Design a protein around this ligand. Structure first.
Ligand code: MG
Lengths: 236, 51, 109, 199, 56
RNA sequence: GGAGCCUCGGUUGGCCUCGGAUAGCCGGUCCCCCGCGGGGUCCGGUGCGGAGUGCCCUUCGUCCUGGGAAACGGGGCGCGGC
RNA sequence: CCCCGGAGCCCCGCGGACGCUACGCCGCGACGAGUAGGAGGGCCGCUGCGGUGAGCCUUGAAGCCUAGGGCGCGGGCCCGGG
RNA sequence: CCGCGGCGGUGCGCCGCGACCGGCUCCGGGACGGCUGGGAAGGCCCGGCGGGGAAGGUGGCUCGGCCGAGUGUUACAGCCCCCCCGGCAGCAGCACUCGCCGAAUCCCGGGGCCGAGGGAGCGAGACCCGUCGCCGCGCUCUCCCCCCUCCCGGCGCGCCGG
């Protein structure tokens, strides 16, 4: 149950030596003096007449495809998306103000909350101010304006995550022929647990943003480029 | 085999040359010691300017 | 509720005197006129918004007549704020002197 | 979306190269007061240059051959046409974009006009050198309307003097209004100078 | 002289030219030096069995 | 007041002094001349131009009610006149 | 101190392809201009003949046209409609 | 049929993102060697010595209000400059960026572009797979200790025990 003995000096490079790690791990004093045809393998079964049947769990298949592809070469370095490292830009801190650029909420200024467990930024503009729900965004699609409120004394709910922000439509077993199968019903509900979570989060955000003067006006405003204003010229 | 650059790939550099581990352990540890000593010299210089 | 893109000019293609490499476009972004200040736009998603006769689809709306040719700003071009782009489809070469849109959301700053 | 350039004091080819490039970059440019264009080198040099240009003409049919435009606006159009790729469709579109005027017309006399210091005589020529006005050059080659343009420019200089007098009156009203209001915009004026205005 | 540029290189120059551009002639083939076993098989009878021996 | 075809460019505007480059911009004009204005003398403020195109002007979320600073302003492609 | 009708293994000296038209398949390294000319491969094309396809065809052969689908670097070829 | 439970080719089209590799092109930093064992420079100046442009002077003239400015005349040092007798941390070819060669006397981090194409299980009761060489590291077969402690347990926001 012991943790890492040497510190991460450079990523991929040990810190002390071979010999100092030898002396710390103590391979000294751990010099250890340590030098079918008849029976069935795995049946699970039983029968009344004829004795007990010898069944075959995970039996042979009934059709083999006439052509098939071979195996691969194990690809040597690949990790799935749930096992990646999660990056953060230096301007995105918990408590900053973001300019959202690509969605239907385009040009809006949002109090940032936290980085989720999927690389997606948690986003909560005040619904009374900017009409923004609990919404995920991405780091590449967002200009991070350097205006940082004090936010560390809040209580975000732990149950909201990437599994909580997930769409649930497009089910299989319908009749699939006619004037049916998801062309109708025209709607999607609000799921009022989302409303209760939005109230419990913006009721903690709002007295910490109405203390700064004109900050609620800056959040109710929308960002837009105009004549004579260029992003390599203005600083944010 | 794809030729990976030994000047950019540390474990390829170690496969070709195992002494590069100590060659990069030094000039990190020694340069960190020298940076600490220069920060200490700057702190002593600021103490001499204050005195 | 306003503009979210920067004004630019499709000034021409990557070319010599008598050659032409149509797979690389030259883009003059308005406002920047130097090699030092065009480091902001390196990698920005850019497009040529046009329209035609037949109605085509639109993501997030009804079908309309507008069309785009998307791309990506590759690197700068020679000391005066001119920059290069490589689109996923080549430009018609009728867009000489017309607007393109360099967006703001490969944002790294 | 339209540049209005003044031809006063600007050099001929120095202005024409910038105009040709900015019109090929897809921008409407209106160059105006083109008889105020001055050309470096003195008057006898520039006059014999244009007289040699007049001598270059087609022997068999001069009406078919080179068209020798005498007006200064069309001389500027010619020296931009010699820089534009006018044998192509984009060059003909650039010639359609460019609008050149002698004097300054009532569609453009009440517009703020621009000055190019990269093509201007005080910036580019040494003050000990010589030059020649394109208006005098055109009038002594054969352009007819220097005096009519002079009287029309005198009329509009009187009108612009009246307008600038009214602008000075509005500006003294603006300054005395700021003097009256600077007690009640005390925290409106300060929040501009803490961010970089009015200082 | 007029077709070449020749000089006296440095230790780090030899290091870049052998690690980054390490191409050996094994059975008259331009094979990359991705392992010390290639040099140890080709020049094992000459005392040069690794990249460091070759650079030295 | 209405859909419906074709062709496209666009993505706030700037509604204006002349003028010199070894100079120029702005005031009252106590002083003078000319037809309220212009011009001349003296004086005063800046001049890498803040009476700045390195500039100026418009906000680009909405509506509910209930206070403070400021304001009699805006509108009905407002009706008639100069 | 035992056999692999099975030690269960990055290697199975026990028979040993999915990979083998061996005139085939596969793995590295270098190179790729061309007239006159020389050589090689054409499952490129025409005509007739000896074999061969239990070949095609009036429920539509050859030929011809094609704003159709394609393949081959190419010579050309296979379909869809009349 | 409910299972996206595991494997394989994948999607009708338009796309986006993440991490990793190869080739590049740039940026921000950190510290090192040589020199004429760098040159002048930054700070306190000390007891002497010589020379030269010409200054809170002297002084012919000019311009103004006892005072200020310009010019010239001998020229000391109280305007300065250079050289010799002799010495103190104060330097890092230095973000007081005044000009070099550079790198086992050298390394870290970041941004932008292009591309991924190769496929060592076709076994009947036994896994439809890992990985080969290199740098490591974590656990276990050795035992203790300190702190933060979060899923959890106890006590009065704090403390105690993977
Ligand atoms: Mg449109």
């Amino acid at each position: 149950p012991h943790c890492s003995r040497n510190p991460v000096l450079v990523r991929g490079i040990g810190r002390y030596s071979r010999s100092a790690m030898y002396s710390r791990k103590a391979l000294y004093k751990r010099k250890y003096a340590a030098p079918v045809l008849a029976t069935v393998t795995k049946p699970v079964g039983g029968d009344k007449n004829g004795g007990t049947r010898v069944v075959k769990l995970r039996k042979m298949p009934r059709y083999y495809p006439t052509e098939d592809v071979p195996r691969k070469l194990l690809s040597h370095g690949r990790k799935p998306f749930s096992q990646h490292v999660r990056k953060l830009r230096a301007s995105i801190t918990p408590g900053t103000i973001l300019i959202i650029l690509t969605g239907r909420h385009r040009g809006k200024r949002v109090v940032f909350l936290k980085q989720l467990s999927s690389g997606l930024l948690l986003v909560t503009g005040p619904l009374s101010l900017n009409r923004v729900p609990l919404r995920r965004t991405h780091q590449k699609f967002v200009i991070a304006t350097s205006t940082k409120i004090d936010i560390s004394g809040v209580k975000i709910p732990k149950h909201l995550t990437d599994a909580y922000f997930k769409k649930k439509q497009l089910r299989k077993p319908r009749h699939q022929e006619g004037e049916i199968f998801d062309t109708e019903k025209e709607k999607y509900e609000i799921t009022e647990q989302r409303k209760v979570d939005q109230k419990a989060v913006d009721s903690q955000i709002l007295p910490k943003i109405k203390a700064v003067p004109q900050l609620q006006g800056y959040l109710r405003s929308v960002f837009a480029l105009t004549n004579g204003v260029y992003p390599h010229k203005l600083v944010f | 085999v794809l030729k990976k650059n030994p000047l950019k790939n540390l474990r390829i550099m170690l496969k070709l040359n195992p002494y590069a581990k100590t060659m990069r352990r030094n000039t990190i540890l020694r340069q960190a010691r020298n940076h600490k000593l220069r920060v200490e010299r700057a702190a002593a210089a600021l103490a001499a300017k204050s005195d | 509720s306003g503009r979210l893109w920067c004004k630019a000019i499709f000034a021409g293609y990557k070319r010599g005197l008598r050659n032409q490499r149509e797979h690389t476009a030259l883009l003059k972004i308005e406002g920047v006129y130097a090699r030092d200040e065009t480091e902001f736009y390196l990698g920005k998603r850019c497009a040529y918004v046009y329209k035609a006769k037949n109605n085509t689809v639109t993501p997030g709306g009804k079908p309309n007549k507008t069309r785009v040719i998307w791309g990506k700003v590759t690197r700068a071009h020679g000391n005066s704020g001119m920059v290069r782009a490589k689109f996923r489809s080549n430009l018609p070469a009728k867009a000489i002197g017309h607007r393109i849109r360099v967006m703001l959301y490969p944002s790294r700053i | 979306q339209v540049l209005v350039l003044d031809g006063r004091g600007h050099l001929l080819g120095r202005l024409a190269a910038i105009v040709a490039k900015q019109v090929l970059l897809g921008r409407k440019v209106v160059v105006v007061r083109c008889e105020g264009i001055n050309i470096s080198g003195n008057f006898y040099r520039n006059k014999l240059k244009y007289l040699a240009f007049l001598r270059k003409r087609m022997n068999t049919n001069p009406s078919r051959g080179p068209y020798h435009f005498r007006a200064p606006s069309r001389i500027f159009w010619r020296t931009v046409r010699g820089m534009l790729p006018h044998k192509t469709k984009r060059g003909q579109a650039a010639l359609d974009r460019l609008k050149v005027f002698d004097g300054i017309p009532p569609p453009y006399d009440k517009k703020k006009r621009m000055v190019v210091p990269a093509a201007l005589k005080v910036v580019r020529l040494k003050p000990t050198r010589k030059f020649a006005y394109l208006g005098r050059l055109a009038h002594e080659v054969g352009w007819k309307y220097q005096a009519v343009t002079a009287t029309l420019e005198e009329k509009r200089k009187e009108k612009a003097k009246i307008h600038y007098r009214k602008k000075k009156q509005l500006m003294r009203l603006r300054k005395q209004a700021e003097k009256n209001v600077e007690k009640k915009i005390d925290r409106f004026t300060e929040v501009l100078k803490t961010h970089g205005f009015l200082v | 002289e007029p077709y070449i540029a020749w000089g006296y290189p440095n230790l780090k120059s030899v290091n870049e030219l052998i690690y980054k551009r390490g191409y050996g002639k094994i059975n008259k083939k331009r094979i990359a030096l991705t392992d010390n076993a290639l040099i140890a098989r080709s020049l094992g009878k000459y005392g040069i069995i690794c990249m460091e021996d070759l650079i030295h």
